[PDB]
Amino acid sequence: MASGGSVIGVKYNGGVLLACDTLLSYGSLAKWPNIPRMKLVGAYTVMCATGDYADFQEMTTMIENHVNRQQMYGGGALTPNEVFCYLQRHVYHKRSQFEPCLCRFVVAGCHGGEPFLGGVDDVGTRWTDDCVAAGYGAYVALPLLRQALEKPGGLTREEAIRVIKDCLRVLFYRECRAINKFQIADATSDMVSIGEPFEVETNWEYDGFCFEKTAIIR
Amino acid sequence: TEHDQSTDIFSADGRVFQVEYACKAVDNGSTAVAACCTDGVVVAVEKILTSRMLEEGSNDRIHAVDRQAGVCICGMLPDGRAVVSRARAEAENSRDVFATPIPGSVLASRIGEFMHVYTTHYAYRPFGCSVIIASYADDGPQLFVSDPSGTVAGYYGIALGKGKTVAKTELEKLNFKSITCDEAVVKLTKILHDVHDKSKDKLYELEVAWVCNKSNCVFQHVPNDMI
């Protein structure tokens, strides 16, 4: 029961960012620190999930195959919105058989210069929005992305990166089952691209963290 | 002469006449040629047009079965189409169950098996098409034909349909160790234009596809600016 932690995403002017770390855990064990968790689905779309990695693999396989087959047999290239709809129907169906997909998905993409971002949870709940997250992202990240998007006229690409990294840094600080190693995908100009892994700068040197002040007994 | 009404029956000479007759459909359909080259496979078919008011892309005889494989149906088109759906299920099966693009020899085997079975049951009839299979998977360029009997054979070059005896004579003058996908598109198109009968079929267009190293081993109709 290889399982993925937090995923986060944010829309900016011209596209959308999705980010996660490259770790699969098993309970508390950090088992694989070099797994690429994001999956390209078709021409415009990218998905990721928190939860059971086996259930993510199975569900994205099924989806990627529908999308590639539909395109190859004359039925055109499915869009983010269509992919998203099909995902939510299958999540729901499985819940309805009591054999759930124990994952929470975030889906992103760009078609017709309109960026998509939405979430689907394991009983089939779906929503779109300017910022979505799964895992401890929903508790730790969303308060920051939401504050950031309060500004009027929206976010530039660079301001969207800065705030994505601050969230990453807090996950790394406060989420147990994480690591300092992340990728970002960027949907923009009707195509998705996945970056190389990177690390964020952290702080550990405050005077209030020193040995004498944190000592339980003087 | 009751011996020719079901395909579940030998004749006294050991023939299966329902299968012969279905082969006659193919032999009176339109002419297709194909060539297995150094860098890929090329197929060309001649569509006899029943009407000047058809949109282009109507009654396509060439279909993709997988990223790397395609078929050209010669004979009755809707029969051919049922064969295309099975071929895709097979190709999908191989990726789903065995994680591999289907090999070309294996896909042709499975198509044959499928056409064979409609040669043995009183309740069905043989298919009235032959299927050219063009592939380029991990086994390299392959060109197979399956026919209504379910016989499958690999080829360097081939021709089916009414023009097929002349087309075969011209395909014999090629050189199959040298010839590329680019040269073949030219030569096969010339052969379909020469075996074409102008008295009988006034309206036609050519369809032509390929799977080569150029196309990044993807089966696809050739871009229309190359004829």
- Judged by CB atoms closer than 8 Å, whether chains meet at A72 and B64 is answered as yes
Query: What residues of A are in contact with residue B90 (Cβ under 8 Å)?
Result: none
Q: How far apart are the first and last CA of chain A?
A: 44
Count of helix runs (H) and strand runs (E) in chain B = 5, 10
- Please state the φ and ψ torsions of residue A131, each to the nearest 5 degrees: -145, 130
Is there a contact between A60 and A216 (Cβ–Cβ < 8 Å)? no
Residue A72 and residue B95: Cβ atoms within 8 Å?
Answer: no
Q: Could B88 and A69 be called an inter-chain contact, meaning their C-beta atoms sit closer than 8 Å?
A: yes
Q: Distance, in angstroms, between B34 CA and closest chain A CA?
A: 22
Contact check, Cβ <8 Å, B88/A65: no
Provide, as residue numbers in chain B, all residues whose Cβ is less than 8 Å from the Cβ of A76. Answer: none
Tell me how far apart the alpha carbons of residues B28 and B160 are, in angstroms, rounded to a whole number. 9
- Letter for the amino acid at B74? C
- Which residues in B lie closer than 8 A to residue A72 (C-beta atoms)? 64, 66-67
Report the amino acid identity of residue B148.
P
Give dist(CA A5, CA A53) in Å, integer. Answer: 10
Q: Are A194 and A183 in contact (CB under 8 A)?
A: yes
B172 in Cβ contact with B33 (< 8 Å):
no
Q: Do A72 and B92 touch (CB under 8 A)?
A: no
DSSP letter assigned to residue B217 = T
The conformation of residue B22, written as its DSSP 8-state character, comes to H
What are the strands, taking DSSP E only, across chain B? Answer: 32-36, 40-48, 62-66, 69-75, 129-137, 140-146, 152-154, 157-160, 204-212, 220-221
Rounded to whole angstroms, what are the CA distances from B102 to B65, B133, B136, B219?
A: 10, 12, 10, 14
Distance CA(A164)–CA(A151), nearest Å, equals 16
Find out whether A195 and A187 touch, Cβ atoms under 8 Å.
no
CA–CA distance, A103 with A135 (Å, rounded to integer):
10
CB A85 within 8 A of CB A63: no
Contact residues on chain A for B95, CB-CB shorter than 8 A: 65
A123 φ/ψ angles, rounded to the nearest 5 degrees = -100, 10
Q: How many pairs of residues across A and B have Cβ atoms under 8 Å apart? A: 11
CB atoms within 10 A of CB B56: 8
Per the CB < 8 A criterion, the answer to whether A149 and A137 are in contact is no
Chain A residues 55-94 within an 8 A CB cutoff of chain B = 65, 68-69, 72-73
Å between B54 CA and nearest CA of chain A: 18
Question: Which string of DSSP letters, residue by residue, matches A34-93?
Answer: -----EEETTTEEEEEEEEHHHHHHHHHHHHHHHHHHHHTTS----HHHHHHHHHHHHHH
**Contact flag A65-B95 (C-beta cutoff 8 Å):** yes
Q: How far apart are CA A6 and CA A37, in angstroms?
A: 11
B161 three-class SS: coil
d(C-alpha A194, C-alpha A171), whole Å = 20
Chain B residues touching residue A68 (CB < 8 angstroms): 67
CA atoms within 13 A on the CB side of B99: 0
DSSP 8-state symbol, A198: B
Q: Please enumerate, as own/partner, the contacts of A209-212 that have beta carbons within 8 Å and a separation of 24 or more.
A: none
Distance from CA of B24 to the nearest CA of A (A): 30
Q: Where are any strands of DSSP class E within B56-182?
A: 62-66, 69-75, 129-137, 140-146, 152-154, 157-160
Q: Which residue of A has its CA nearest to B218?
A: A72
Supply B118's token pair: 């409609």
Of the CA atoms within 13 Å of residue B47, those in its CB half-sphere come to 19
- Which B residues, 50 through 89, put their C-beta within 8 Å of a C-beta on chain A? 64, 66-67, 88
Which candidate in A64, A65, A66, A72 is best for mutational testing of the B interface (most B CBs within 10 A)? A72
How far is A131 from chain B, CA to nearest CA, in Å? 35
Query: Which chain A residues contact residue B64 at CB under 8 A?
Result: 72-73
User: What's the CA gap between A119 and A131, in Å, rounded?
Assistant: 10
Phi, psi values for residue A92, rounded to 5°: -70, -45
Closest residue by Cα to residue A161 from A183, A177, A143: A183
Of B127, B176, B142, B148, the residue nearest B70 (C-alpha): B142
Q: Are strands A114-120 and A126-128 parallel, antiparallel or unpaired?
A: antiparallel
- Method of structure determination: cryo-EM
d(CA B132, CA B160): 9
CA distance A77 to chain B (A): 15
A65:B64 CB<8 A: no
Chain A: closest CA distance from residue B102 (Å): 15
All residues of chain B having their beta carbon less than 8 Å from the beta carbon of residue A69 are 88, 92
CA dihedral (B34, B35, B40, B42) in degrees, to 10, reads -30
Contact indicator for A78, A71 with CB cutoff of 8 Å: yes
State whether A69 and B95 contact (CB < 8 Å): no
**Cβ neighbours of residue B136 under 8 Å, at least 6 residues apart?**
B40, B41, B68, B69, B104, B142, B211, B212, B217, B219
